From a paper:
To gain insights into the molecular mechanism of SFX, we purified recombinant TraTpKpQIL from E. coli OM vesicles in CYMAL-6 and determined the cryo-EM structure. Analysis of the purified TraTpKpQIL by mass spectrometry confirmed that the first cysteine of the mature protein (C36) is modified by DAG and PA, which agrees with previous reports. The map displays 10-fold symmetry corresponding to ten copies of TraTpKpQIL. Each TraTpKpQIL protomer consists of three amphipathic TM helices (α1, α3 and α4) that anchors it to the OM, a central β-sandwich domain (β1–β7) that is flanked by two α-helices (α2 and α5) that protrudes to the extracellular space; β5 and β6 form a β-hairpin perpendicular to the top of the β-sandwich domain. Each protomer associates with one DAG molecule, where interactions occur exclusively between DAG and its own protomer. DAG is found in the interface of the TM helices α1, α3 and α4 and forms a hydrogen bond between its diacylglycerol moiety and the backbone of T137. The decameric structure is predominately stabilised by interactions between the extracellular domain of the protomers; the α-helical barrel domain does not display significant interactions with adjacent protomers. The arrangement between the β-sandwich domains, including the β5 and β6 intertwining, results in the formation of a cyclic architecture that consists of an inner β-barrel with a diameter of 48 Å. The conjugation frequency of [name] into recipients expressing TraTpKpQIL was reduced by a log-fold, −3.6, compared to the baseline level of conjugation, −2.5, in the absence of TraTpKpQIL.
Author numbering:
A (entry chain A), B (entry chain B), C (entry chain C), D (entry chain D), E (entry chain E), F (entry chain F), ...: 36 to 261
């Protein structure tokens, strides 16, 4: 059974968290960190801010509420979240066909037993095939993919020139190009973290705590155990 | 049955809302937001503007009606909406063929019963096959895809130069290139939100409230819980 | 039956209207709109101008007949219209083959009845197969695709320079390049609206009113509920 | 029968006329139009100029014979015309094979009747198969595709510089590049109109009147109902 | 029979003539035309010059023999001509296989008749199969494709600079680049005309008159009915 | 039989001659032509010079032996000649397989005749199959493809600058770039002529006269009937 | 059995560690190394820092805690870690199908033994097939792929100019370009190390010690046995 | 038999010689030619230089041994020579399989004759199959391809500047770029000649004389019959 | 047998030696050559240097040991050598499968002989199949491909500027670009020679003498028979 094979394979929650690329930070004596965590996804990660703060404080850093007097900024946005069924990557044999067959066959388990009436065996076989198809189709091999954008700002003594260049699309024909220049002492680096939570019939509120834990640990480990 | 498998799989409304990319906003003391929400799609989202206003006010911001004295602009356009049937991605076994066969076979359930007249059984089998094909073809696995364009304007102290460059197509041969330059204190950033509402025999007015709720929450969360 | 499945699936008129991209307009106090609606398609949309005017007036704008003293221009052209049959995307099984077979088989419904004469049954079976093929081939699953070009002109205080650049093809060898420069206070943005009207045996005059209604609502909603 | 299915499907003349791109014209008080219509195709469209003149005059414009004092020029060229059979897109089953089989089988309709002589039945079956193949092959599902080039010249007050640049090919090795510059007050825009006339066994003189009517209406509607 | 299907389908001569692109000519009072028609093809079009002259004179123009005092030049070259059999696009079933089988079978039409001697029937069947293969292979579905290059020179008042740039290949390694500059009052535009003559067992001398007629009409119509 | 089909199809010599592109020559009063014909191919075309001279003289030109005082140069090089079997484009069924089978079967034409001895029939069948394979493989469907390079030099009054640029390859690593500049009054244009001679078991000396005739006529017709 | 084949093939832990490219270091007398090891992966490598320190000290270098007075910097980041099952590269035959069949067949090992009751044999066969499918699906051929980024900084006497160029993405439309310039005496080179740990039913904590050992040896060997 | 078909097809030596591109030489009064013929191929062409000298002298030129006072240089290098079997383009049926089968079958030609002993017939059949496979595999359809580089130097009065540019590869990382400039009165042109010698079981010393003859004739004909 | 077919086909050593491109050398009076032959391949060519010296001396040149006073340099490096089996290009039928079958069948040659005991025949058949598979797999159709780099330096009177440009890769991130300029009177040209030695069960020491002979002859023939 494909459904039972999936239910056996992915029987326990499996969470993966992969940073896209490395952000290199010079050794520094800064201890203050300012956190700005946002969530533009349909899923709920409300404890991610507190978990990032706790992980950062575990490394000796101090979380401050004043962005101007903070050596580091951790700007994170839980940008996206998608849910997919991996079984559908197999096309057919995933809509309950084999689940209906296994159960249409089991309906013949009444012919060799008490009642072998043709109408009765047909009815029981049909009901068993329907129940088998329902059980096969109700096995959801769900994978939640989350995409988080991270932007670390480190305060330096070097004058950094920011050149904002926005190309705003304007109706299939034009663009409005906005350009501006600012000067400040802050190097900003970006990165992306991709999280995955896989399980059979997985409901997101079960995967949310571990997802937040791993994401917070990764984002805090960007700073390293200073 | 493929139709019944679909009706079981997608039996409850499933709404997804995914922002395209992250708009980074500096920590600010601005509290005023001006909303400009438009809808150039055939579907109806009349409550989206009010839901965005409520979500923004929940974060401590204040929605104002004067665009000139607003620290933030949320300009949103529900640009597009499409409806498709996902079953049609399977080609055949989606036009009622298998639903006709399941029912043409069930018409033989009269031969082994009261009347086994050849004309009667043929007629009942044909009617049952027609009804099965109709029921299979009437199972619509509908997916509504919505595209919303968001444009956030943040008022700054930096002089921003906007260079409008429109390349208007002119009859398969030419272009009229319009260029202009303006100066103002407003950085404009764009982004795109893709919404999906999936269900069996889904009617849009059922999916509209949750679609608006999720879209409003995402667009407001762009500003973050300031 | 493929024909019957199509007639069941697309039994009621389905109209879609999708704008290509968003035209962003700054908040403004302009209330005057000038409409220029043209139709270079073989289909007839004569009521589109009045419907656009009514939809625009519903938003508080005022439609004027003087292009020079109009804050906004709505220039629309119903550029193209095509009609196709979607069943032909399936290649064969859509020219009446299966509709002929279903009916050639039904011609055997005379052998088991009053007259089983070989000539008579052959003739009735042939006539029934011909009628079945005709009925299958007469089921038209028609989709009208309409392309409209929209050009919104908004009057500004910024000097706008228009550089007309036309590359006129000249006989497989040359081009005449026409260049000119104009100055005026009007930003012109473009966009495209794609309409679809789908039904079984759909005749365009039935789809035209709703097509115009949706197109007018979309084009007027470009301006937003000002 | 594929031939019969085609004869049923495309039983009445179907004419389509699609402009390639939109030519945008500013609102103007010009009322004079000069028409220059040419036909470098093997087909005959002699009434096209008169139909364009009538359609233009219906919009309030006035057709003049002096190109120098005309606000608008409508320069049209019926460049190309091709005729194809769409059945040949199916490869085989379109050269009379199935039409021969349907008729070779019908030749057996003499064995069960008056004369069942082996020579006689063979001869009648062969003749019937030949006639069936001839009738199937004589069913022409013809599509006429016509390509028209349109060049609208609008007289302006802006000085327009035309830079003629012709790259004349010279024997697989060279090019003669002719360049010249002229100055005049006329913006020239181009566009293309594609016409299709589809029917079974369609003869062009039947499709020519409606083809001209639709083409003239489209080209005149370029000017819009001024 | 594929051969019979071809002989029925393309039973009468079909001539097509398609100009590549449009050459736009300004309205002019010139009436003199100078013709220079050449033929570097293996086929013969000797009457093309006279037919072009007649068609041009029918439009009111006057054909002159002095190139210097001619308002228009019509320079045409019948560059290429190819002959192909379209049946060979089907690969096999076009070399006489099926024509041999149809006739090998007909050789059995002697067993059921006067002499059924094994040697006699084998010999007659072999001869009939050979004759059938010969007749099938002797059915030529011929298509003549002709390519003509046209170069129209129109005398203007604008000074036209011709920059001859020839890149003469020199033995797999080098090029001799010849460059020169001339000045004259003549705009030269090019174009290409593709002619097709299709028929079963078509001999070119039958297709030549109509081919010349259509080509001359097209090239003359480049000038338009001035 | 594939061999018989080929021998019937291509039973008479078929010669094609196609110029690559058109060389445009201005109307001129020059009457002197200088011919330089070379042949770097393995085939023999010794009469091509005389045939070109005769064709040129037929047009009123005069062939001269002094290159300096010749208005026109016809420089031709019969660069390449290849011979191929077209039957081998079919892969198998062209090495004698079917020719062996047709003849292995004909060896059974001795069993039903005078001697039906197993050894005798086996020997005769083997010999007949060998002879059939030999006859099939000895059917050569030969196509000679010839490539000629033509270079026409026309004497003008315009100063022509020739920039010789040769990039001589030097051992997989280097190039010696030779550059030089000359000035002379002669425009040189190139072109290519592709000839084909097709027949069954064609020997080149049979195709050479007509090949030369067609090539000479084409190259001379480059000049046109002046 | 595919599961048995996997369990036999990959029965013992196999660890691979491959550096991407070579970092060339000049011969030097520096003996001080500063280590900065971070881990932004979900896996745990806490002993990697100590192992790198031990391996470096084995080569004669001295690990220091002051980054400013260190001749060498070893900056390493265990960026990513993924876990996959290689059996799934075979598609089917890996979800327990063949493991179910091997065991459904073994359930017939009760018919030829003590109890051959149809119900009993069916039940035992079903249970054995379920157990076989479970055992097949419980065989995990796991491969852990770890990606580490290494950045070696070597202190020189040459002035090194660092030009920070960050292109921060801003919402699908814009980029903020940050540019800065610093000067210092430190050449920084990068590289990447890819580690793999393969085994059947491998749990990461078993592979972690050897993974750390190999990674530390490789990163330390970058410095060479100085 | 494929082997016998090949031995029949390519039974006599077939030599082809094709120049790559044309080297155009101006008409000249030079009569002195200097030959430099080299052979860096494994094959032997020792008589090529003498054959080129004889062919050149046949055209009226005079071969000289002083390169400085020679109007023309013919520099030729027989660069490459490869030998291949064309039968191997058919994959199998070319290693002796079918030749083994034809002979394994012929071993049954002893059962119906004097000795039908099972051991004897098996042994004779095996020996015959081995001999047939050996004979089939010993049929070599060999094609020798030769590549010759030709460099013609023509002495002129124009100053020719040679810019030697050699990019010498240096160990997967670098290049040494050598550049030099010389001035001399000699235009050098290149070209390539491809020779083919095809036959069954062809040994090169048989094809060498004709190969040299054709190559010499082509290279000498570059100069033309001056 | 595939193995026997290979052993028959490639029964004698076949050596090919192909130079990549031609190095053109001007006629010169230099007679001194300096040889620098290196071998960075795993194979042994120790006699190549002496063979090159002998071949060069055979042409009249004199081999010198002083690089500074040598008109020519022959710098050669036997860069690479690979050994492959061509039979593996056929995938299966080359690992002994067919060789096992031919021999498993021959094991049945004991049933029809003295002992037909089932155990005895099974054992003898298994042993014969094993021996056949071993003999098939022990037939090695080996091809040695050798790559030699040649660099000819010719001393000139022209000043040659060498621009060394080395781009040394530095750890997946950087490059050290080394540039230098030298001046000397020596043109250096490169080329590549590819050698192949093919035979069944070929051992390199048997192919080495002929490989060296051919390579030396080719490299010496670069200089030509001066």
């Amino acid at each position: 059974c494909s459904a039972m094979g999936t239910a056996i394979k992915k029987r326990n929650l499996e969470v993966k968290t992969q940073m896209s690329e490395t952000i290199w930070l010079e050794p520094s004596n800064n201890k203050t960190v300012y956190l700005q965590i946002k969530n533009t996804s349909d899923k709920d990660m409300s404890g991610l801010q507190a978990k990032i703060a706790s992980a950062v404080t575990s490394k000796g850093y101090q979380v401050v509420s004043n962005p101007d007097t903070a050596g580091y900024w951790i700007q994170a946005n839980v940008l996206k979240a998608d849910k997919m069924d991996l079984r559908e990557s197999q096309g057919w044999l995933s809509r309950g066909y084999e689940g209906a067959v296994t159960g249409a066959a089991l309906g013949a388990g009444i012919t060799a037993y008490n009642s072998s009436s043709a109408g009765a065996t047909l009815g029981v076989g049909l009901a068993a095939g329907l129940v088998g198809m329902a059980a096969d189709a109700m096995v959801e091999d769900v994978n939640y993919t989350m995409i988080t954008d991270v932007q670390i700002a480190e305060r330096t003594k070097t004058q950094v020139q920011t050149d904002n260049v926005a190309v705003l699309r304007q109706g299939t024909s034009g663009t409005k190009v906005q350009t501006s220049t600012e000067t400040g002492n802050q190097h900003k680096y970006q990165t992306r973290v991709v999280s995955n939570a896989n399980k059979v019939n997985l409901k997101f509120p079960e995967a949310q705590p571990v997802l937040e834990d791993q994401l917070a640990k990764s984002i805090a480990n960007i700073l390293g155990s200073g």
